[PDB]
Amino acid sequence: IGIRLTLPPPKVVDRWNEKRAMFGVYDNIGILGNFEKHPKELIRGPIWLRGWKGNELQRCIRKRKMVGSRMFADDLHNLNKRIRYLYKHFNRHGKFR
Amino acid sequence: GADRMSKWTSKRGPRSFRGRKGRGAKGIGFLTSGWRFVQIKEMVPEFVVPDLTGFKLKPYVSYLAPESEETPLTAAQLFSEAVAPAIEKDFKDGTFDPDNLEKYGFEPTQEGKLFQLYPRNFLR
Amino acid sequence: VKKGFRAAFRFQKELERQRLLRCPPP
Amino acid sequence: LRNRVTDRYFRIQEVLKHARHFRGRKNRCYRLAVRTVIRAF
Amino acid sequence: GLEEFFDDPKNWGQEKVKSGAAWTCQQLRNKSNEDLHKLWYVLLKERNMLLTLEQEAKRQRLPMPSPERLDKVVDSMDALDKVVQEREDALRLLQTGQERARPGAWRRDIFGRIIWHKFKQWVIPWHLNKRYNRKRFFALPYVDHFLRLEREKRARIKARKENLERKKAKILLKKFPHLAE
Amino acid sequence: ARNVVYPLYRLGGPQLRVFRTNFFIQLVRPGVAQPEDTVQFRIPMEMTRVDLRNYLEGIYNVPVAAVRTRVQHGSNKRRDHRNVRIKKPDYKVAYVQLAHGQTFTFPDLFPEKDESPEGSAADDLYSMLEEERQQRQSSDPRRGGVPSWFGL
Amino acid sequence: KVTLPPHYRYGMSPPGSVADKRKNPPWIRRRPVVVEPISDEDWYLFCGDTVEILEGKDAGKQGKVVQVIRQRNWVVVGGLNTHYRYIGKTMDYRGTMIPSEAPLLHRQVKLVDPMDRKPTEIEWRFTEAGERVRVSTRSGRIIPKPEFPRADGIVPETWIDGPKDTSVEDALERTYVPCLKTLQEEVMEAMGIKETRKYKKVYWY
Amino acid sequence: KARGNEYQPSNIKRKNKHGWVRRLSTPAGVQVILRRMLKGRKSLSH
RNA sequence: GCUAAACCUAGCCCCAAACCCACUCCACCUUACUACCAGACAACCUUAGCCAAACCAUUUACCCAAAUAAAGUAUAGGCGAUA
RNA sequence: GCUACCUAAGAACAGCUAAAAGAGCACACCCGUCUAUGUAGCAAAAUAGUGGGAAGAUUUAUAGGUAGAGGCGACAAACCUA
RNA sequence: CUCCGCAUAAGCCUGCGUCAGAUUAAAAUGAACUGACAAUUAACAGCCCAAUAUCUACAAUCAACCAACAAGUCAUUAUUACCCUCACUGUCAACCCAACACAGGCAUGCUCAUAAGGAAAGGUUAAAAAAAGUAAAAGGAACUCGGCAAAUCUUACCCCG
Ligand SMILES: [K+]
Ligand SMILES: [K+]
Ligand SMILES: [K+]
Ligand SMILES: [K+]
Ligand SMILES: [K+]
Ligand SMILES: [Mg+2]
Ligand SMILES: [Mg+2]
Ligand SMILES: [Mg+2]
Ligand SMILES: [Mg+2]
Ligand SMILES: [Mg+2]
Ligand SMILES: [Mg+2]
Ligand SMILES: [Mg+2]
Ligand SMILES: [Mg+2]
Ligand SMILES: [Mg+2]
Ligand SMILES: [Mg+2]
Ligand SMILES: [Mg+2]
Ligand SMILES: [Mg+2]
Ligand SMILES: [Mg+2]
Ligand SMILES: [Mg+2]
Ligand SMILES: [Mg+2]
Ligand SMILES: [Mg+2]
Ligand SMILES: [Mg+2]
Ligand SMILES: [Mg+2]
Ligand SMILES: [Mg+2]
Ligand SMILES: [Mg+2]
Ligand SMILES: [Mg+2]
Incomplete structure (x- = not known):
C-alpha cells in the first residue's frame, strides 16, 4: 500500500531541442551590444515581476498598484486580505525584534 | 420539508390554489x-x-425521385x-406610376384586413 | 499516483527476491 | 513543486524486520513496534 | 371514422411495413397552399395511427413494426411547416418590412440583464393596466456589482476552456509528432 | 393549436379559426372495463374537450355525444445514478362516448397468427447455429468424459 | 435522440445498442482514447474499397472494407485480422465458433491501385468536369468511390410504390403560383368561407 | 414538551413568506435572488 | 486464501494575449415560469468594528490611474504606538 | 408555519346538581401535582397510574401583524424555529 | 383486542394495483425496493358579479313567556347597460410534522360501541437480580425527613395568599 506495483513509463528527454540548445543566448546583449539593451528586458512574464524581486508582501503590494485596477473583484479582495495578514505577521510576529 | 425543486402545479396547494391554476x-x-360560465362561440x-x-x-x-437541391425562398x-412580370409589362406599355402600386399587389397598411401580417391576428 | 522512479525500481527488486524465495529456481 | 515521500515503505521495514519475532501487535504495527525495538537495542 | 386510427387490417401482426421516403422541403415548394393545407391533414392522420400503434406496442410489450415510419412523417410535417412559414415571412418583409411576426423590444429586467420582451395582447393601454405597471424594466445601482461578478464568472469559464484546448493540442503532438506541419 | 399565441377576441369580432392544427392524439386501450360506446384517448394538456369534439367530427367524421377529461400525474419517484429524480411526463386522458348507438372495441393489432410467419424464414446465421446445435450430442456417461473426436 | 456522455468511447458495436449500453453505462468514466485529427475532406477510405494490410497477423492481404468508424479512425475489412469467438452460447451448449474481425487503423492499411494490385498513396485532385477524385501518387490513375448499399437498405432499382407512397409524377408536379396571399386567405377563397366581421385593434405591450 | 415539529407546512404561508413576488418586493430580496443566480442555484425561491 | 492493494487520465492552477456582452416556438414581478381590463409605490444619505497601542478613551497602513529614484526624507502624531 | 402578545372572520364544550354563577361533581378536550419506569429511550422531555381545570381571564383550526441598539411579556431576566 | 373506525380540511405527491425480478423484510408466499404497464372521468368542491346614487335604530338563546349585559354574524331601492350559456382545475394510496415503517404531535363531522379496524406469544426452559401485577397468618405507621407508595373513602387546627 502506498507504492506502485509497476514501473512508470520511461522519462525520455531531448537534450538538444530548440529551447535547450539555445538557452542562455543573448544574456550578454548589453556587454556585447554596446549596452543598447539590458538583460532584464529579455525576461517575460507578469508585468509586475519583470526585472524585480521581493518577498510575498512586496510582491503583493507591487501587484496591487500596477494591475490592481484590472483585477477581478474576488481576486482583488483576497489580495487586500493577504496584504493585511502579511503586514501583521512581518511587523508584529516573529522570534527576533 | 417542502420540495422547492419540483414543478409547481394545480395539484398542489389548498382548494383555492388548485382551482385558480391551470394547465x-x-x-x-x-x-x-353565480359562478355561471358563459361560452363564446x-x-x-x-x-x-x-x-x-x-x-x-x-x-x-417514392424513393425513385431526383435529389433536387434546396433553394430557401426569399423576399x-x-x-x-x-x-x-406585371411591372415590366406596364413599363413597356408606358403606363406606370407609384400611385398604382396598390393595383400591382402592394398593401399600404394592414388595418381593415382579416389576416394581418404584423402584428398577425390568426393561427397557423 | 506519486511521481518518481527510484522507489518503484527498488520495490521491483524486493518483489523479485520474494518471488525467488516462494519459487526457488532449480 | 509538490514533493511527497515515495519510499516510506522501506523506512518502516528496516524497523519491523527487528520486530518479527516479537509477540502481539508490536510485531507488525510500526507505532507499537518502534517503541519495543528501541528498548531491545 | 375510428378506422383511420389503425393501419390496414391485413398489416396487423406483420413485423415490417414497407414505406416510401419522407417529403423534402424542396418538393413542397412546388405545391400550392391549398395543396399543402390538404396534405397537412393527410400526414396528421398517418401520424396519429403511428402514435396509436407505438403506444399499443408498449401495452403488449412488443417492438413496433417499423418505427422509421413515424420519424419520416414527423420530418415531413416539419418540412411542410417550414415552407409555409417561409412564404409568410417573405410576404411580411414586402408589405411591412418586419423580421418578427410578434412585436417586442429590448429591455433591462429588474436583475440588470438584457432580455427581449415579447409583447402581449391587451384591451387597455399600458398606463392604465394595474398588473403591467407593477413590473419593473429598470435596474438600480445595487445591481452593478453583481453584473461584474457574473461577467467575471463567464470570463473564468472561457479562460479554462481556451487553455484546456491548447493543452490537448500540445499533448497531441507527443504521440503524433508528424503533425508539426 | 399549442405553443402559439391566440388572437384576442372582442365583442363583434371574427370567428377564431385554425387551418393547420398541431394537436396530435393517440387512441389507447382502456386499462379497466368501460362501456361499449366509450372510447379512450390521450391528448395534449392544452387541448380541451370542446376541441376534441370538433377535432374528431371534422377530421375523422365521428359523431360524439359526450367528452370527459382528466389529468394523470406522472411519477417523479424514479432516481438516476446521481440520485436525481426522473419525471414521467404528465398526460391528459379523454373519454369519448359515441352518439348514435355506435359501439367501439379496441382491435387486436398484434394477432399471433399474423405474427407467426407462414413463409419459411432462413436466416443464414440462425441456420448455422441450429444445424450445429442439433448435430452435436451430449457426452455419453459410459465414455467417462474421454474425448469422442478420436476414432482410435 | 442521442445521449452520449462527454468522453464516450466509440466501439465496434453501434451506439445505443444493448451491447453498447452494457459496455458503456451512463456512469462509467474511462481515459479518453487519443485519435489523430483528420479533416473529413482528407479522409480517403470508404466502405466497399479494397485495401492492403501493412502490419498485423496477416500482412500483405487485400480485402474489402465493410465498415469504417470515423471517430476512432478505424477500418474494418472482412476476413482479415480476425480472431475466433464462440457465438450463440448457452449454459448447456458451448456454442458455435466464428471468426471475428478486429478494427484496423487508417495507417495500418494502404489503398491499392486498380491497374496494379499493389499498395499506393493517393492525393485528391479535380477532373475536367470539376468533380473531386482521389489519384494515386505513383502511376496516377483515377480511383472512384466504390458503390455501397445504403444503410437503410432500400434498393432504388427494386422499389415498388405502395398504397401510401406518392407517385413520381404527382410528387414532382408543380402547382404553386407565386402570389401575395397567405395560406389562410387563399384557403378561405377555395373552401368558400366568408367572414364580414372586422377585427378590432388591440394594444401590444 | 417534545420539540422538533416546528415545521407545520402551509403552502400559502410558504409562497407569501419566501416566494418570488416577496423577494422582488424589497431591494434586499432582489439581492438574494442575485446571489443565488451568481452561485448557480437550481432553485432561486419557493 | 479473503478483504484489499496498485494505475493516468478527467480536469484544474498561475501568467500572457484579447475588452466584454443573446436568439426556434410558447411561458414567466399574481402563489414567477399563470393567454385577455381603469392605473399613477418608486432610485441616491460619512461604514462600523475586530485589531495595534501589551488596558483604554485621541489615534492604528487598506490599489485609485507611470516602474525606478527623490524617501521612509519633509511633515503629522495620547510628538506614543505608528502614519 | 415553534413560541409571546395582538388583528380579522370561524369552531368546540356529554350527562348530573343548581339553574344565579370567572359555581360544584364529572367525559371529550386543555394542563402537567406526586410516584415508578425510562436515561444513546418509543421520545434531543416519553410511557403507565395518580392528579388540576373543564360556559370561561376557556380551548382550538385558518390567514395576517410586531425583528435583534429590537420585539413581546398577568417580570419567570420568560419566549422570539429543540 | 378494539387504544378505534369511515369521511372532510390541511399536508404529501404515485409511496403494498398488474406483469417481472439477481432487490428486500427475522422470513430464497409477501413486498412499502427496482424495471415496465395501467390509473383519479362532475353533479361534490374550487374558479364569480356592469355603473352611479341611495337604503340598512329594534340581537342570539326551540324566541314564545321571562330576564339580562359583555350590547351582538347575515336585509335595499332608483335609473342606465345587459338574449351565446355548462369551459378550465382538484379527485390515487397503507399518506402529513417528528433524521426511522418512531409508544410522540395533529382541526372538523358521523359512529359512542361498532356492520368498521386490528394481533400482546420466533421456539423452548420456567435460576438470580430487575420491572408490572394479584393474594396474604397475627399486629396495624412500630416504616420514613415525610403515611412516599398502596389500601381506604376520613376529624380538627395553624402559617401564607
Ligand atoms: K517580525
Ligand atoms: K484587551
Ligand atoms: K404522498
Ligand atoms: K414518543
Ligand atoms: K373486522
Ligand atoms: Mg374534472
Ligand atoms: Mg490594545
Ligand atoms: Mg400551529
Ligand atoms: Mg378578534
Ligand atoms: Mg356542560
Ligand atoms: Mg367552574
Ligand atoms: Mg371543577
Ligand atoms: Mg400569557
Ligand atoms: Mg423576579
Ligand atoms: Mg433572578
Ligand atoms: Mg357545482
Ligand atoms: Mg377519495
Ligand atoms: Mg406479536
Ligand atoms: Mg421470546
Ligand atoms: Mg427474582
Ligand atoms: Mg397481612
Ligand atoms: Mg415513627
Ligand atoms: Mg393514625
Ligand atoms: Mg424509626
Ligand atoms: Mg399517596
Ligand atoms: Mg392563590
Missing part, C-alpha cells in the same frame, strides 16, 4: 354572477378541414416571380 388551455369564455377555434377526396398526394414519397425571389 395551459386557452379560455373560451368568462365567469358571470367566437373564442372556440374552428377547425378548417378540407375535402380529401381525389387527392393524389400521400403521406410518403426578392418572390418579388421577381409574381410582382416583376
Whole structure:
C-alpha cells in the first residue's frame, strides 16, 4: 500500500531541442551590444515581476498598484486580505525584534 | 420539508390554489354572477378541414425521385416571380406610376384586413 | 499516483527476491 | 513543486524486520513496534 | 371514422411495413397552399395511427413494426411547416418590412440583464393596466456589482476552456509528432 | 393549436379559426372495463374537450355525444445514478362516448397468427447455429468424459 | 435522440445498442482514447474499397472494407485480422465458433491501385468536369468511390410504390403560383368561407 | 414538551413568506435572488 | 486464501494575449415560469468594528490611474504606538 | 408555519346538581401535582397510574401583524424555529 | 383486542394495483425496493358579479313567556347597460410534522360501541437480580425527613395568599 506495483513509463528527454540548445543566448546583449539593451528586458512574464524581486508582501503590494485596477473583484479582495495578514505577521510576529 | 425543486402545479396547494391554476388551455369564455360560465362561440377555434377526396398526394414519397437541391425562398425571389412580370409589362406599355402600386399587389397598411401580417391576428 | 522512479525500481527488486524465495529456481 | 515521500515503505521495514519475532501487535504495527525495538537495542 | 386510427387490417401482426421516403422541403415548394393545407391533414392522420400503434406496442410489450415510419412523417410535417412559414415571412418583409411576426423590444429586467420582451395582447393601454405597471424594466445601482461578478464568472469559464484546448493540442503532438506541419 | 399565441377576441369580432392544427392524439386501450360506446384517448394538456369534439367530427367524421377529461400525474419517484429524480411526463386522458348507438372495441393489432410467419424464414446465421446445435450430442456417461473426436 | 456522455468511447458495436449500453453505462468514466485529427475532406477510405494490410497477423492481404468508424479512425475489412469467438452460447451448449474481425487503423492499411494490385498513396485532385477524385501518387490513375448499399437498405432499382407512397409524377408536379396571399386567405377563397366581421385593434405591450 | 415539529407546512404561508413576488418586493430580496443566480442555484425561491 | 492493494487520465492552477456582452416556438414581478381590463409605490444619505497601542478613551497602513529614484526624507502624531 | 402578545372572520364544550354563577361533581378536550419506569429511550422531555381545570381571564383550526441598539411579556431576566 | 373506525380540511405527491425480478423484510408466499404497464372521468368542491346614487335604530338563546349585559354574524331601492350559456382545475394510496415503517404531535363531522379496524406469544426452559401485577397468618405507621407508595373513602387546627 502506498507504492506502485509497476514501473512508470520511461522519462525520455531531448537534450538538444530548440529551447535547450539555445538557452542562455543573448544574456550578454548589453556587454556585447554596446549596452543598447539590458538583460532584464529579455525576461517575460507578469508585468509586475519583470526585472524585480521581493518577498510575498512586496510582491503583493507591487501587484496591487500596477494591475490592481484590472483585477477581478474576488481576486482583488483576497489580495487586500493577504496584504493585511502579511503586514501583521512581518511587523508584529516573529522570534527576533 | 417542502420540495422547492419540483414543478409547481394545480395539484398542489389548498382548494383555492388548485382551482385558480391551470394547465395551459386557452379560455373560451368568462365567469358571470353565480359562478355561471358563459361560452363564446367566437373564442372556440374552428377547425378548417378540407375535402380529401381525389387527392393524389400521400403521406410518403417514392424513393425513385431526383435529389433536387434546396433553394430557401426569399423576399426578392418572390418579388421577381409574381410582382416583376406585371411591372415590366406596364413599363413597356408606358403606363406606370407609384400611385398604382396598390393595383400591382402592394398593401399600404394592414388595418381593415382579416389576416394581418404584423402584428398577425390568426393561427397557423 | 506519486511521481518518481527510484522507489518503484527498488520495490521491483524486493518483489523479485520474494518471488525467488516462494519459487526457488532449480 | 509538490514533493511527497515515495519510499516510506522501506523506512518502516528496516524497523519491523527487528520486530518479527516479537509477540502481539508490536510485531507488525510500526507505532507499537518502534517503541519495543528501541528498548531491545 | 375510428378506422383511420389503425393501419390496414391485413398489416396487423406483420413485423415490417414497407414505406416510401419522407417529403423534402424542396418538393413542397412546388405545391400550392391549398395543396399543402390538404396534405397537412393527410400526414396528421398517418401520424396519429403511428402514435396509436407505438403506444399499443408498449401495452403488449412488443417492438413496433417499423418505427422509421413515424420519424419520416414527423420530418415531413416539419418540412411542410417550414415552407409555409417561409412564404409568410417573405410576404411580411414586402408589405411591412418586419423580421418578427410578434412585436417586442429590448429591455433591462429588474436583475440588470438584457432580455427581449415579447409583447402581449391587451384591451387597455399600458398606463392604465394595474398588473403591467407593477413590473419593473429598470435596474438600480445595487445591481452593478453583481453584473461584474457574473461577467467575471463567464470570463473564468472561457479562460479554462481556451487553455484546456491548447493543452490537448500540445499533448497531441507527443504521440503524433508528424503533425508539426 | 399549442405553443402559439391566440388572437384576442372582442365583442363583434371574427370567428377564431385554425387551418393547420398541431394537436396530435393517440387512441389507447382502456386499462379497466368501460362501456361499449366509450372510447379512450390521450391528448395534449392544452387541448380541451370542446376541441376534441370538433377535432374528431371534422377530421375523422365521428359523431360524439359526450367528452370527459382528466389529468394523470406522472411519477417523479424514479432516481438516476446521481440520485436525481426522473419525471414521467404528465398526460391528459379523454373519454369519448359515441352518439348514435355506435359501439367501439379496441382491435387486436398484434394477432399471433399474423405474427407467426407462414413463409419459411432462413436466416443464414440462425441456420448455422441450429444445424450445429442439433448435430452435436451430449457426452455419453459410459465414455467417462474421454474425448469422442478420436476414432482410435 | 442521442445521449452520449462527454468522453464516450466509440466501439465496434453501434451506439445505443444493448451491447453498447452494457459496455458503456451512463456512469462509467474511462481515459479518453487519443485519435489523430483528420479533416473529413482528407479522409480517403470508404466502405466497399479494397485495401492492403501493412502490419498485423496477416500482412500483405487485400480485402474489402465493410465498415469504417470515423471517430476512432478505424477500418474494418472482412476476413482479415480476425480472431475466433464462440457465438450463440448457452449454459448447456458451448456454442458455435466464428471468426471475428478486429478494427484496423487508417495507417495500418494502404489503398491499392486498380491497374496494379499493389499498395499506393493517393492525393485528391479535380477532373475536367470539376468533380473531386482521389489519384494515386505513383502511376496516377483515377480511383472512384466504390458503390455501397445504403444503410437503410432500400434498393432504388427494386422499389415498388405502395398504397401510401406518392407517385413520381404527382410528387414532382408543380402547382404553386407565386402570389401575395397567405395560406389562410387563399384557403378561405377555395373552401368558400366568408367572414364580414372586422377585427378590432388591440394594444401590444 | 417534545420539540422538533416546528415545521407545520402551509403552502400559502410558504409562497407569501419566501416566494418570488416577496423577494422582488424589497431591494434586499432582489439581492438574494442575485446571489443565488451568481452561485448557480437550481432553485432561486419557493 | 479473503478483504484489499496498485494505475493516468478527467480536469484544474498561475501568467500572457484579447475588452466584454443573446436568439426556434410558447411561458414567466399574481402563489414567477399563470393567454385577455381603469392605473399613477418608486432610485441616491460619512461604514462600523475586530485589531495595534501589551488596558483604554485621541489615534492604528487598506490599489485609485507611470516602474525606478527623490524617501521612509519633509511633515503629522495620547510628538506614543505608528502614519 | 415553534413560541409571546395582538388583528380579522370561524369552531368546540356529554350527562348530573343548581339553574344565579370567572359555581360544584364529572367525559371529550386543555394542563402537567406526586410516584415508578425510562436515561444513546418509543421520545434531543416519553410511557403507565395518580392528579388540576373543564360556559370561561376557556380551548382550538385558518390567514395576517410586531425583528435583534429590537420585539413581546398577568417580570419567570420568560419566549422570539429543540 | 378494539387504544378505534369511515369521511372532510390541511399536508404529501404515485409511496403494498398488474406483469417481472439477481432487490428486500427475522422470513430464497409477501413486498412499502427496482424495471415496465395501467390509473383519479362532475353533479361534490374550487374558479364569480356592469355603473352611479341611495337604503340598512329594534340581537342570539326551540324566541314564545321571562330576564339580562359583555350590547351582538347575515336585509335595499332608483335609473342606465345587459338574449351565446355548462369551459378550465382538484379527485390515487397503507399518506402529513417528528433524521426511522418512531409508544410522540395533529382541526372538523358521523359512529359512542361498532356492520368498521386490528394481533400482546420466533421456539423452548420456567435460576438470580430487575420491572408490572394479584393474594396474604397475627399486629396495624412500630416504616420514613415525610403515611412516599398502596389500601381506604376520613376529624380538627395553624402559617401564607
Ligand atoms: K517580525
Ligand atoms: K484587551
Ligand atoms: K404522498
Ligand atoms: K414518543
Ligand atoms: K373486522
Ligand atoms: Mg374534472
Ligand atoms: Mg490594545
Ligand atoms: Mg400551529
Ligand atoms: Mg378578534
Ligand atoms: Mg356542560
Ligand atoms: Mg367552574
Ligand atoms: Mg371543577
Ligand atoms: Mg400569557
Ligand atoms: Mg423576579
Ligand atoms: Mg433572578
Ligand atoms: Mg357545482
Ligand atoms: Mg377519495
Ligand atoms: Mg406479536
Ligand atoms: Mg421470546
Ligand atoms: Mg427474582
Ligand atoms: Mg397481612
Ligand atoms: Mg415513627
Ligand atoms: Mg393514625
Ligand atoms: Mg424509626
Ligand atoms: Mg399517596
Ligand atoms: Mg392563590
